[PDB]
Amino acid sequence: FLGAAGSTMGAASNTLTVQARQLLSGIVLGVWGFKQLQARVLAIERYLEVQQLLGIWGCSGKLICCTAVPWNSTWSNKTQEDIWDNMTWMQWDREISNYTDTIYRLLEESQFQQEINEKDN
Amino acid sequence: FLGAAGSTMGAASNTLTVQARQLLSGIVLGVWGFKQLQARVLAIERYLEVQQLLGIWGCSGKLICCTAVPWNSTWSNKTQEDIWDNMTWMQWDREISNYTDTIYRLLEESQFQQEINEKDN
Amino acid sequence: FLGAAGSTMGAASNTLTVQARQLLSGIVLGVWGFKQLQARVLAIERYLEVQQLLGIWGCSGKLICCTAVPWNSTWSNKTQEDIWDNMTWMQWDREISNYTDTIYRLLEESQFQQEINEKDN
Amino acid sequence: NLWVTVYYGVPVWKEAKTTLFCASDAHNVWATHACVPTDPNPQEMVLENVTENFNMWKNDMVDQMHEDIISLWDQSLKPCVKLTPLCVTLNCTNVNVTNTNEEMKNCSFNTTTEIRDKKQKEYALFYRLDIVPLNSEYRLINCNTSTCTQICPKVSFDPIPIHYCAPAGYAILKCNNKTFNGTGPCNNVSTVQCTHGIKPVVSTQLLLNGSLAEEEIIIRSENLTDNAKTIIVHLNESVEINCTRPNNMTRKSIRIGPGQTFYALGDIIGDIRQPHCNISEAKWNKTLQRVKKKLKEHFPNKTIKFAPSSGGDLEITTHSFNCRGEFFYCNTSKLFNNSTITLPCRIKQIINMWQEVGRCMYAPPIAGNITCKSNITGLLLTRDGNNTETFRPGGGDMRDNWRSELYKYKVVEIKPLGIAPTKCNR
Amino acid sequence: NLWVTVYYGVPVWKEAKTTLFCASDAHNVWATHACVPTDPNPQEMVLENVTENFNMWKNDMVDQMHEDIISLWDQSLKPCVKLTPLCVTLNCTNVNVTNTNEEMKNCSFNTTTEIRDKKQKEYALFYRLDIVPLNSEYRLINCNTSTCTQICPKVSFDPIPIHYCAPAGYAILKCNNKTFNGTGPCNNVSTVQCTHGIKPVVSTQLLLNGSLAEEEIIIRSENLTDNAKTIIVHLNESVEINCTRPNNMTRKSIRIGPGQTFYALGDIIGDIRQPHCNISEAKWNKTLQRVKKKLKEHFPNKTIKFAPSSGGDLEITTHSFNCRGEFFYCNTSKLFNNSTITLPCRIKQIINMWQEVGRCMYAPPIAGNITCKSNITGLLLTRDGNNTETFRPGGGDMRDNWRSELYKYKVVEIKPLGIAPTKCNR
Amino acid sequence: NLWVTVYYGVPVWKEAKTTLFCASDAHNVWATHACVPTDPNPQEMVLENVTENFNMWKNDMVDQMHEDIISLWDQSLKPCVKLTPLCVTLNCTNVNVTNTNEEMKNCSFNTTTEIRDKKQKEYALFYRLDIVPLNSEYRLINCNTSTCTQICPKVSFDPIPIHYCAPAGYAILKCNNKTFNGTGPCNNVSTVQCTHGIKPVVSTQLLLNGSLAEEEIIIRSENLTDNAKTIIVHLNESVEINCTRPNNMTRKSIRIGPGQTFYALGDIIGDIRQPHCNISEAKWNKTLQRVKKKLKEHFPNKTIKFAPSSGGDLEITTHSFNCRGEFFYCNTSKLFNNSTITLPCRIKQIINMWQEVGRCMYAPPIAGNITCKSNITGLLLTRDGNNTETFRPGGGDMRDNWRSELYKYKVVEIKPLGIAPTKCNR
Ligand SMILES: *[C@@H]1O[C@H](CO[C@@H]2O[C@H](CO)[C@@H](O)[C@H](O)[C@H]2NC(C)=O)[C@@H](O)[C@H](O)[C@H]1NC(C)=O
Ligand SMILES: *[C@@H]1O[C@H](CO[C@@H]2O[C@H](CO)[C@@H](O)[C@H](O)[C@H]2NC(C)=O)[C@@H](O)[C@H](O)[C@H]1NC(C)=O
Ligand SMILES: *[C@@H]1O[C@H](CO[C@@H]2O[C@H](CO)[C@@H](O)[C@H](O)[C@H]2NC(C)=O)[C@@H](O)[C@H](O)[C@H]1NC(C)=O
Ligand SMILES: *[C@@H]1O[C@H](CO)[C@@H](O)[C@H](O)[C@H]1NC(C)=O
Ligand SMILES: *[C@@H]1O[C@H](CO)[C@@H](O)[C@H](O)[C@H]1NC(C)=O
Ligand SMILES: *[C@@H]1O[C@H](CO)[C@@H](O)[C@H](O)[C@H]1NC(C)=O
Ligand SMILES: *[C@@H]1O[C@H](CO)[C@@H](O)[C@H](O)[C@H]1NC(C)=O
Ligand SMILES: *[C@@H]1O[C@H](CO)[C@@H](O)[C@H](O)[C@H]1NC(C)=O
Ligand SMILES: *[C@@H]1O[C@H](CO)[C@@H](O)[C@H](O)[C@H]1NC(C)=O
Ligand SMILES: *[C@@H]1O[C@H](CO)[C@@H](O)[C@H](O)[C@H]1NC(C)=O
Ligand SMILES: *[C@@H]1O[C@H](CO)[C@@H](O)[C@H](O)[C@H]1NC(C)=O
Ligand SMILES: *[C@@H]1O[C@H](CO)[C@@H](O)[C@H](O)[C@H]1NC(C)=O
Ligand SMILES: *[C@@H]1O[C@H](CO)[C@@H](O)[C@H](O)[C@H]1NC(C)=O
Ligand SMILES: *[C@@H]1O[C@H](CO)[C@@H](O)[C@H](O)[C@H]1NC(C)=O
Ligand SMILES: *[C@@H]1O[C@H](CO)[C@@H](O)[C@H](O)[C@H]1NC(C)=O
């Protein structure tokens, strides 16, 4: 994990497998037992929270995903080629960090609209 | 969660997203630490049991599901419109409560038959 | 679980549902509470490790799976009909056990190639 | 034809008996610094067109909270200074008096402090409720069955409210019907994650700082025909109570064990008065008239009389409560037979509270001039046994004190997997 | 061409050393109220056409169960009354006698009970196996290395069976071959979730209330050539043993430590007899003949002799066992050299059982007239060193007692992910 | 048009404050047998073209490690022999002397060992730093505020390195810039799972067996303008230090409590010398010149002087450190004003280390002839208050000792869910 973090957005988009893989393990009695027990409960809770966030969107079980919602320009007006070949994921998040919550709400309600459209059967 | 529970079966069939959503969170050192640790282990065990039950049928990862098995009349002979437009979920379960286990066994074996039919490849 | 273990590979290939089913339950305060708590944490960690291994391959949520990679002869040159009708799964593993790690690496990298081939969109 | 179909998350809730976790708002005994902060965000969800059965005085939450507050008190009390060395014979005598108040004694003993060395005389005062004579000669009352540890002054046991939440998959349904009498069905039920208010106030015969009822006065009791089962009564309006200990007392920090400091009464500076509670007699008379009217509503026009306790212990026959550091016991025989009513209250130090075999506690004195202003909001009544019904204040079981607040809460687990028919094939 | 394929749940089981959790059927020391209830539902699954290697006396489950029963005993024994004040000099003398039985002494001491006050004389009886003389003058035997806490009478340490289960992903394979001698391969193996029977009965040289063997008699031993490794022998048929302590003794509830109560022998009402075990001499002779025949089957027609223990401690040289509250030690030299055979048995009180440095226990007396009827089902034999083999009862390591029941259980983890070739493309 | 898209596992790392778990390489106080084995496999991952802000002396890991080593020491020290009986008056006198060395006393007391029986005289030696006179007559220094338990000799408190790892979803970023001064941005940052080296060595004013710096010497300090904040200085090259206690002392195993053994100095066989440290004066002079040059680099050509401690306690004014079983305190006034430099060092026994209220420890003596060879690699400097700056060794806060090793580690949680636009429809 934390591999091409220094590379561009597009370059990072190709090497995301390692972060997905190394999430349930490492890089491969109150003395210490409770410490590792709490650690390994926290690990699975983090993994399951990621799974839940992927599930309530239309990406349950997919490394790559696409949605139906196109975002408004106010969040960012940067050009695509500049976006995917000049900066990294962190500064992109920092630019968006003020808007992450809004998109997740937009994501989840978009799924509800999509499922109900597909629920007509 | 527990939304249209007062509304009809059909009305409840449209507002089932909130119960599915709020299942890994709330409505948004033996002092208390062990208490919340045991609570949050119970939470994930409940969530994983639901996931297992959904997986061993043909509904792994779907809020809406359909099966191939049509149930016998003996469990209920009520008309569809009366079921879905006059009645809630609870005492409907109470009516089926005596037969809940049988359908689960019927569900899982019907699932196995569908795989082995699709496993011919 | 551990059912047709004595039967042939082909016979065992038909009765694998019970092992998949009975993995989150049984066959159906330091006195003992910590003992069962540690046991039921180990159970879910084992189940989640199996889920992760299935997910990072092209078999997320499938009891039966096929892959694109054909293996080399060096691991085994036994005939198919002999393989699937004469021995059991354990001696097969013991024959392959020296190669299990290599195939998993081959499995995961083959999976990545298939995604990037399907990621061209 | 129709086919069965599986829906994930239909609204069905099963029964109770799971585990709840604490939550405290923005030190003390029930560790506030050990619960997750409450996101206050008061949020509920009214369930229109529902009905369900509550069975208040059998609830799980009451038992969990009581068994848990015991595990908090008896775990914060674990590391404090014990008392076994302080049980020698006590050579005491009377204190100086000026007006008719016996009650306090100027005891003296020999304390082991540096081991196999000179032992101080170290006089100290003690109430004549913490002393038994082994016939001049006296001893601590609780040095015959159990040795107990003084509650360290650095921590304070005044109550601040606790919020009992539920983990995922568990919701606490709350009945908002005004006229609800604890058991039976009720409409207009909401769902909650974290309970409201509920301050762990320990009292007897007078619920203090409790949650008011609404509209009218309600009566709660297992079986009105049965006699041994307790009776709880809420109050339409709180009755103000103002209870004072008007003395200025000195705190002798004395040694006993290396790193074992024991705090005893030093001296009383000023006049020797009596501790005494105050109640508005007109307000109490109006409240008593209203409550007896409500109870006669529950009986066939039967005359009802009130009488004090019969023969219990000092923890039962008196309005035992916890003020700012001290433990008061008030003989409430005056209430139950512009002008205030005064209750004479005796203060105790080594108490056996919750009535455990193996537990007591030494309450270090507060430095004088303590007052407690609170609201009487509950009455704990029982009747015993012609054509008349007699009601007496009665405690014993502490659980009822928690039952008066959690009367509108039940815990239910969610059953998200539902099955139903429709026209769907695969 | 063929392609590899992944199957979820093929029957492959890996090795051992995981954690097991208790399960008790419908108080005592090994807390029954602390294990999950067993769904009895006897369910197994025979695995036809399999074979695997068992290595009994290296198993994990034996070590886990022993290390766990230690953590149960030494955790239930945590809150009981200690014994440090009761170690003063004891001025004792002999008890009244009528017939030839020394063995019991009428000791007297000075007990600290109210601290810095008058101390009672408080006579009490003590066996001349709990006493060492520091040369008239005596002391408790275990007040030189370790202080121990009397096992509180409210709890009872009689054994009821425990069921050791396995968590998910772990199955305990059980070998059902009748003639299985602990180690090696065996056919007709079933799989289980929760183990059968296994009562934690602590004994020595005579397994009591144990599981019978089947068909013939089996011999289990690490290496028959080695001498230091123990030997276990099951029994074709149980040999009934009936052991009685025929006295009526009084229990003096005495104080010592405020809130602490110590229970000592008060007096013996009636005749002074000896505690003695009973065995059917004809049945034992037949059993001994059969077992020595079985062992001569294992040796080249070698004459075999039995001899008692050589020089061990009273916990080893004698059939040490636990009756209904008391601890018996029987000199079994009679068995090993219509008519019954009698064993003289001495009863001990402060015992160092499991042979720990830092542990003993005081067993409060039972109120007289105690009997224990049980079945001898196991023999713990060892040999030492011409053309003869001599076998002696021998204990020391307590683990062997658990090994006699769990000889047919191993724990295995499941490997559900299997890989195999077939004609399947994507 | 473009559409938002969700990628699982983009490289974004959030902030800190999670929990870390131990890992030990191939007994002692910080239980090595209680951490998971480290798969050594030195593996990192350099992050090219990145930059981030480190804020060393506010880090989480330092606080977690210190609060955890306290919970290890004060939990391994839980079951050891206490000391309350050994606090009687001590009738002492001087020891025999031959050369000018007071310092050790031949104390004598009365120890309770068999309770209400004869008490031995049981002479024992004690340093005149473990003794306070209650004016011939003396007592243990720490029998006025806290009673402490001797660290049992079977365990050894010499440091072996610990490896602090991170659980899943958490990575410790490590800055590999050579000239890094603790705070600010730095390039060439790698990611790690388990930290390197870091031996928990407790010291003062002289970091011992610590990690060397690289290239030049670095200065770390909260605010160079502030005076109360500590100052840490790494060393370009280690300065060898060789400290010896040249006596042969006897260990009296004495009884105190049934199963309570206390170990006191028995006698000194041979000559009575002084404990002392040795440093290469030429090497130290060169090191001091280089470090003061580095600090004058940080100031506008200001003359800098060194002075010893002002008025602190013996734990602060002296190079307090832990040798092979003993606790040394060295007056380092010589260093700071082919020929070696000698430091006179006094050895203490009952120490209050980490400066807790309620904690001390008795260090049982080692059987003579102890030496410690180590490397000075750090200087803990502070300045107080004309046109001159004066630096003094200064400790007090123990956390700084851990801060000198973990200066290049931060913990970050991974945010695998990323969102970004592309031409993708559904
Ligand atoms: C007891 O009752 C008060 C009543 O509430 C107060 O009412 C007065 C006027 O009736 C109003 O001026 C105050 O703002 C109200 N709130 C107060 C005083 O906090 C309750 O609020 C409390 O439960 C009790 N008052 C106490 C303990 O002082
Ligand atoms: C010791 O052996 C008995 C044998 O089982 C009993 O056998 C008799 C006849 O042989 C039969 O009548 C009883 O019902 C059987 N069961 C009993 C007595 O429980 C075992 O059952 C026990 O392990 C032992 N008997 C004891 C301890 O009384
Ligand atoms: C203090 O410094 C040594 C330096 O490393 C040693 O260097 C010498 C030559 O300079 C070389 O011969 C040794 O192999 C090196 N390693 C040793 C001695 O272990 C550090 O290694 C240690 O931190 C210190 N040496 C001690 C404590 O003996
Ligand atoms: C107790 O106090 C009385 C007061 O008269 C005094 O005479 C006596 O000596 C004191 N001590 C004892 C042991 O009585
Ligand atoms: C306590 O110590 C005093 C010392 O004067 C002694 O006289 C007294 O008897 C001791 N105990 C009593 C009786 O209080
Ligand atoms: C409750 O108080 C209100 C306040 O005015 C009063 O009108 C009503 O009668 C009271 N009811 C009872 C039952 O006390
Ligand atoms: C209680 O009431 C009495 C009335 O006589 C008054 O004198 C006293 O001060 C009151 N106590 C208080 C207000 O604490
Ligand atoms: C012990 O018992 C004997 C019995 O003769 C008695 O004489 C003696 O006084 C008792 N106490 C002592 C200290 O010996
Ligand atoms: C125990 O107390 C008695 C009191 O009569 C005393 O005579 C005896 O010496 C004390 N200790 C002994 C020796 O038993
Ligand atoms: C076991 O007991 C049966 C019962 O009759 C007997 O036939 C058989 O010979 C015995 N075998 C051994 C080895 O004791
Ligand atoms: C043991 O056997 C003997 C035989 O003489 C008998 O007298 C005695 O009562 C027996 N004990 C019992 C049955 O407890
Ligand atoms: C202490 O040691 C001195 C040494 O002269 C001796 O005289 C004295 O008796 C001892 N004990 C006391 C109580 O002083
Ligand atoms: C300790 O015991 C001795 C016994 O000789 C006694 O003389 C002494 O006074 C006691 N305490 C002192 C003063 O050391
Ligand atoms: C560090 O040591 C090297 C070794 O030769 C030396 O060249 C350099 O000047 C030193 N720098 C400092 C700042 O001590
Ligand atoms: C310390 O240095 C002095 C120099 O005079 C030397 O005599 C002594 O032996 C040294 N101590 C050691 C090497 O432990």
Residue numbers in the entry:
A (entry chain B), B (entry chain D), C (entry chain A): 522 to 549, 568 to 660
D (entry chain E), E (entry chain C), F (entry chain G): 35 to 60, 68 to 142, 154 to 187, 191 to 322, 322A, 323 to 353, 355 to 392, 411 to 458, ...
Sentences from the paper on this structure:
Soluble Env trimer immunogens that have been removed by genetic cleavage from their native membrane-bound form, however, have exposed protein bases that become immunogenically dominant.
Constructs with the most added PNGSs, N28-JCBv3-660-665, for both BG505 and ConC, were selected for further analysis as they were the best cleaved, and in the case of ConC provided the highest differential in sera binding. This stability is slightly reduced for BG505 compared to its protein-base counterpart, but the stability is increased for the ConC glycan-base constructs, likely owing to the additional DS stabilization added to the glycan variants. We solved the cryo-EM structure of the glycan-base ConC trimer to 4.1 Å resolution. The base as a whole was shifted nearly 5 Å, and the C-terminal 10 residues were not resolved in the cryo-EM density. This unfortunately included the region where PNGSs were added, so we were not able to visualize the structure of the glycan additions. The ConC cryo-EM structure, however, did reveal greater mobility in the base region, and all of the introduced PNGSs were disordered in the electron density. While the BG505 glycan-base trimer did show antigenic evidence of a greater propensity to open (e.g., increased binding to V3 antibodies in the presence of CD4), the ConC glycan-base trimers did not display signs of antigenically opening or disassembling and thus appeared biochemically stable in vitro.
